[PDB]
Design an enzyme around this catalytic site. Structure first.
Site, PDB file in Angstrom:
ATOM      1  N   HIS A 102       0.997  -1.190  -0.100  1.00  0.00           N
ATOM      2  CA  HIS A 102       0.019   0.115  -0.097  1.00  0.00           C
ATOM      3  C   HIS A 102       0.848   1.279   0.020  1.00  0.00           C
ATOM      4  O   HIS A 102       0.350   2.397  -0.069  1.00  0.00           O
ATOM      5  CB  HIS A 102      -1.115  -0.106   1.199  1.00  0.00           C
ATOM      6  CG  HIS A 102      -2.120   1.144   0.965  1.00  0.00           C
ATOM      7  ND1 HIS A 102      -2.276   2.051   1.904  1.00  0.00           N
ATOM      8  CD2 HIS A 102      -3.058   1.216  -0.162  1.00  0.00           C
ATOM      9  CE1 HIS A 102      -3.046   2.845   1.515  1.00  0.00           C
ATOM     10  NE2 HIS A 102      -3.940   2.273   0.436  1.00  0.00           N
ATOM     11  N   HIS A 318      -8.229  11.175   0.260  1.00  0.00           N
ATOM     12  CA  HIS A 318      -7.482  10.000   0.346  1.00  0.00           C
ATOM     13  C   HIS A 318      -6.104  10.130   1.229  1.00  0.00           C
ATOM     14  O   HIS A 318      -5.533   9.270   1.381  1.00  0.00           O
ATOM     15  CB  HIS A 318      -7.300   9.411  -1.146  1.00  0.00           C
ATOM     16  CG  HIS A 318      -6.899   8.142  -1.343  1.00  0.00           C
ATOM     17  ND1 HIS A 318      -5.645   7.774  -1.589  1.00  0.00           N
ATOM     18  CD2 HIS A 318      -7.354   6.984  -1.445  1.00  0.00           C
ATOM     19  CE1 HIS A 318      -5.331   6.419  -1.728  1.00  0.00           C
ATOM     20  NE2 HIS A 318      -6.510   5.846  -1.708  1.00  0.00           N
TER      21      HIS A 318
HETATM   22  N1  LIG Z   1     -11.012   2.103  -6.732  1.00  0.00           N
HETATM   23  C1  LIG Z   1     -10.032   0.990  -6.337  1.00  0.00           C
HETATM   24  C2  LIG Z   1     -10.272   0.427  -5.043  1.00  0.00           C
HETATM   25  O1  LIG Z   1      -9.836  -0.807  -4.959  1.00  0.00           O
HETATM   26  C3  LIG Z   1      -9.557   1.274  -3.830  1.00  0.00           C
HETATM   27  C4  LIG Z   1     -10.141   1.946  -3.081  1.00  0.00           C
HETATM   28  C5  LIG Z   1      -9.466   2.658  -1.998  1.00  0.00           C
HETATM   29  C6  LIG Z   1      -7.722   2.725  -2.190  1.00  0.00           C
HETATM   30  O2  LIG Z   1      -6.942   3.470  -1.504  1.00  0.00           O
HETATM   31  C7  LIG Z   1      -7.125   2.111  -3.465  1.00  0.00           C
HETATM   32  C8  LIG Z   1      -8.152   1.571  -4.293  1.00  0.00           C
END
Ligand SMILES: NC[C@@H](O)c1ccc(O)cc1
Ligand code: VO4
Length: 424
Positions: A102, A318
């Site tokens: 991640h 995000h």
């Molecule tokens: N839209 C892709 C979904 O799998 C997703 C959702 C959140 C994230 O941080 C990364 C990917």
């Protein structure tokens, strides 16, 4: 500007709100250095889009993609990359189930030195379009005079910490980047690296990763003085049957260390509905009803996304941040920007009677400590002293607010674009 902490450009806000903001194109631009090679660590990739973010003159320089995809997903990624001779891939081993790779990081090798970028965005158009995202830009790290003997290390041990982080992948393609970092002077670095990596860690190894790493740095490098903890994130793991299983016990304990109210900021359905994106913002806030119904207790901790200070109330987060503000929110004891969301997978959970730290995922963040600057605290910059990118104090969910949950329908009210949300 000691912090070098930036937000991504948000398209469709007044240009004033984008003045100190960076798009990936600005990060990769020739003003930043003469590119020679790069490594892009991330979770999701759009290779065609990615290559276009590089300036034309740099588009043919080698690029390594470090991802965690497997099977058909790995196949797809390789497929995306094939057309591009200059691109290689490195599959990060994910030996533990429900782990993800991640971490969001760029390693940027130039003729003039080396740059490291640790940020929160996936390499896909929408993550850089109308979201609130965070970026830390290292300084330009010079090459060590190939005739001198020096560590190139900083007081925060960033250089060795980054090398240990890369070392844990046990990957041949990264060794080359480890060698590059060896050859550069990272001594001007004033932040601490906080990484997560998959594993079950014993004894001394506990302090190396996840929330124990944070706890360790806060012990050694902050000092003491009802200062709340604030956590801010876009994904929510399964935290247990109640707060004592993990959230208020081991996790908050790490967070409150120095030498207690817990504010969690997570978008409500209403925040998402009226956002610049509307409901499709929820695609990047993957909180499932399955998980949410297991832990309804958690939601009394939740506060709304509000970012008037940075003009981004409508730009869904995000970014992930954690910090330790004073009771009146005018100062902070530290600030963390990281890829780690609010999950045991990202932060670590204690196993075998508290002697083992289990982490599932790769994650990476930078910690800003006043001591690294020779201060005791940072004053909060009231209008986007540390640039806190969202409003304080955090505002509690109303009685009719619900946390955004991705996999249920919302059809009673249309969003910003006159659309409904029916996942399926
Ligand atoms: N839209 C892709 C979904 O799998 C997703 C959702 C959140 C994230 O941080 C990364 C990917
Ligand atoms: O890329 V994920 O929060």
């Amino acid at each position: 500007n000691p912090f070098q902490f930036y937000l991504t450009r948000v398209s469709g806000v007044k240009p004033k709100y984008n003045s100190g903001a960076l798009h990936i194109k600005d990060i990769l631009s020739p003003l930043f250095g003469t590119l020679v090679s790069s490594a892009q660590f991330n979770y999701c990739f759009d290779v065609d889009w990615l290559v276009k973010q590089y300036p034309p003159e740099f588009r043919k320089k080698p690029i390594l993609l470090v991802h965690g995809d497997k099977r058909e997903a790995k196949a797809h990624l390789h497929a995306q990359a094939k057309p591009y001779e200059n691109i290689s891939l490195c599959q990060a081993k994910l030996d533990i189930a429900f782990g993800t790779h991640h971490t969001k990081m760029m390693l940027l090798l130039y003729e003039e030195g080396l740059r490291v970028v640790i940020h929160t965005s996936n390499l896909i158009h929408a993550d850089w379009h109308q979201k609130t995202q965070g970026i830390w830009l290292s300084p330009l790290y010079p090459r060590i005079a190939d005739g001198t003997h020096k560590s190139g290390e900083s007081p925060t041990h960033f250089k060795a910490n980054l090398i240990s982080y890369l070392t844990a992948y046990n990957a041949p393609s990264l060794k080359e980047w480890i060698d590059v970092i060896h050859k550069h002077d990272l001594s001007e670095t004033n932040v601490y690296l906080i990484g997560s990596t998959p594993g079950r860690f014993q004894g001394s190894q506990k302090d190396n990763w996840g929330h124990f790493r944070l706890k360790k740095l806060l012990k050694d490098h902050a000092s003491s003085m009802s200062w709340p903890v604030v956590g801010q994130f876009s994904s929510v793991g399964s935290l247990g049957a109640d707060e004592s299983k993990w959230l208020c016990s081991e996790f908050k304990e790490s967070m409150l260390t120095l030498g207690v109210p817990l504010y969690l900021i997570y978008p409500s359905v209403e925040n998402v509905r009226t956002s610049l994106e509307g409901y499709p913002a929820g695609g990047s806030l993957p909180y499932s009803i399955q998980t949410a119904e297991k832990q309804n207790w958690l939601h009394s901790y939740f506060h709304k996304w509000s970012a008037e200070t940075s003009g981004r109330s409508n730009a869904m987060p995000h970014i992930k941040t954690y910090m330790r503000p004073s009771p009146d929110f005018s100062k902070i004891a530290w600030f963390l920007v990281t890829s780690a969301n609010l999950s045991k997978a990202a932060w670590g959970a204690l196993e075998k009677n508290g002697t083992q730290l289990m982490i599932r995922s790769y994650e990476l963040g930078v910690l800003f400590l006043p001591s690294a600057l020779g201060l005791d605290s940072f004053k909060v910059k009231q209008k986007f002293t540390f640039p806190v990118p969202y409003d304080l104090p955090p505002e509690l969910y109303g009685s009719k607010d619900r946390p955004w949950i991705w996999n249920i329908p919302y059809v009673k009210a249309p969003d910003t674009h006159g659309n409904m949300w029916v996942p399926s």
